[PDB]
């Protein structure tokens, strides 16, 4: 019944900035709002309680204030491991209500990615398949080009992509690429080439390795 | 401290009900305020109901009486029950503690604290199937690991000697495939001078279908 209203729904960055989100109810509340973090993977964690109060342990950036309908809460000072969504929730009615949310991103310097390729494990070609793992390492932006090359020949279609979160300590990426192949058609060709093109490289970066040898 | 445990993941077919159990052991009370709150992936935090410790109920109207909470003190267990499925109900499914944990200027404050660690609850037709596990093999820094392929539903967790081995590790996010089963990759960096001497070994655990594999990872 108590609807809360959450802005922005998102916001990047630099560490060291100050941060501000806000909150608003569709009715009175007092004080009876909470905040809650949480970091990818996780329940949320209760920073502010009573509006306005920071739960023990939580660090002194954090604050929050308001009473009545409009709330804020403040990072006075963005860090790396405040990488996380921010809920407000009141607490007025027992038909408790959240907002729908903002997700806190963080902006840092260009970092290049670590390249790394994996061929089929000798046991999943037993099974008629084979996969082949490219990996990018902590890296920033999170944008990067990765292209399969058999036999020099660019691939379409066979491949699929997994990205991490940004890490809570030094705010990068890691990706995979997985291009998926029949036992019959990797045997076809002997060069897997996994190339990667990304801000932080001058020029693509190419990984490879010839099947069996 | 209290400390909420539920029940495990699994997959549920359209139409039915799904019931989440959250057992609560070691804080000072013999029952609590116990609230049930629902994460869609992508999605933000949905209150659904609560339960006081004389066993009051309070539910969402959104709901529509789809949510039944009960509790069996016996077992300091409180259940979520949630009917009529759709694949819309996908979701983690948390209780928490919604108890008063502070009052001042006349009035007390409730908040959410401890939570459950969460029941990822996937609505669907499919059927469970456990992960096969593969390696991904081997100057400077080297990179290793475990590819977890075509299981369903979510999810899957992974760690590395147990959980002994936490630094440079990167599991994945699950990818779907055309298939229709999950596919994911748990990759660690390690030192290179270090292969061949320690070993390394990803723990797979699937709970909807009891799968727990070990794969011992070498060059």
């Known amino acids: 019944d108590i609807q809360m209203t959450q802005s922005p729904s998102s916001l990047s960055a630099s560490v060291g900035d100050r941060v501000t989100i806000t909150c608003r109810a569709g009715?009175?509340?007092?004080?009876?709002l909470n905040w809650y973090q949480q970091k990818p993977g996780k329940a949320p964690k209760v920073l502010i309680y009573?509006?306005?109060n920071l739960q023990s342990g939580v660090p002194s950036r954090f604050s929050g204030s308001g009473s009545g309908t409009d709330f804020t809460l403040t990072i006075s000072s963005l860090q790396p491991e405040d990488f996380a969504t921010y809920y407000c929730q009141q607490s007025h009615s027992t038909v408790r209500t959240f907002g729908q949310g903002t997700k806190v991103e963080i902006k840092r310097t260009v970092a290049a990615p670590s390249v790394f390729i994996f061929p089929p494990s000798d046991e999943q070609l037993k099974s008629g398949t084979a996969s082949v793992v490219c990996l990018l390492n902590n890296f920033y932006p999170r944008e990067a080009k990765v292209q399969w090359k058999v036999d020099n020949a660019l691939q379409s279609g066979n491949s699929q992509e997994s990205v991490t979160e940004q890490d809570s300590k030094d705010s990068t990426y890691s990706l995979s690429s997985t291009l998926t192949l029949s036992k019959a058609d990797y045997e076809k060709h002997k060069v897997y080439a996994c190339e990667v093109t990304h801000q932080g490289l001058s020029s693509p970066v190419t990984k490879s390795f010839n099947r069996g040898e | 401290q209290v400390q909420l445990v539920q029940s495990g993941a699994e997959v549920k077919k359209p139409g039915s009900s799904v019931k989440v159990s959250c057992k609560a052991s070691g804080g000072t009370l013999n029952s609590y305020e116990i609230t049930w709150v629902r994460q869609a992936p992508g999605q933000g935090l949905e209150w659904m109901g609560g339960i006081t410790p004389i066993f009051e109920t309070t539910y969402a109207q959104k709901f529509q009486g789809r949510v039944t909470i009960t509790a069996d003190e016996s077992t300091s267990t409180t259940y979520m029950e949630l009917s009529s499925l759709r694949p819309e109900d996908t979701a983690v499914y948390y209780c928490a503690r919604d108890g008063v944990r502070y009052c001042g200027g006349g009035r007390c404050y409730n908040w959410f604290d401890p939570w459950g660690q969460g029941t990822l609850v996937t609505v669907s037709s499919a059927s469970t199937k456990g992960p096969s596990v593969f390696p991904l093999a081997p100057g400077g820094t080297a990179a290793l690991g475990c590819l977890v392929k075509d299981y369903f539903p979510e999810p899957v967790t992974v760690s590395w000697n147990s959980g002994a081995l936490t630094s440079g590790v990167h599991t994945f996010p699950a990818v779907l495939q055309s298939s229709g089963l999950y596919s994911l990759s748990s990759v660690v960096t390690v030192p290179s001078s270090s292969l061949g001497t320690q070993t390394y070994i990803c723990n797979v655990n699937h709970k909807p279908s009891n799968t727990k594999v070990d794969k011992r990872v070498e060059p």
């Open positions: 009715q009175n509340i007092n004080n009876y």
């Open positions: 009573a509006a306005s």
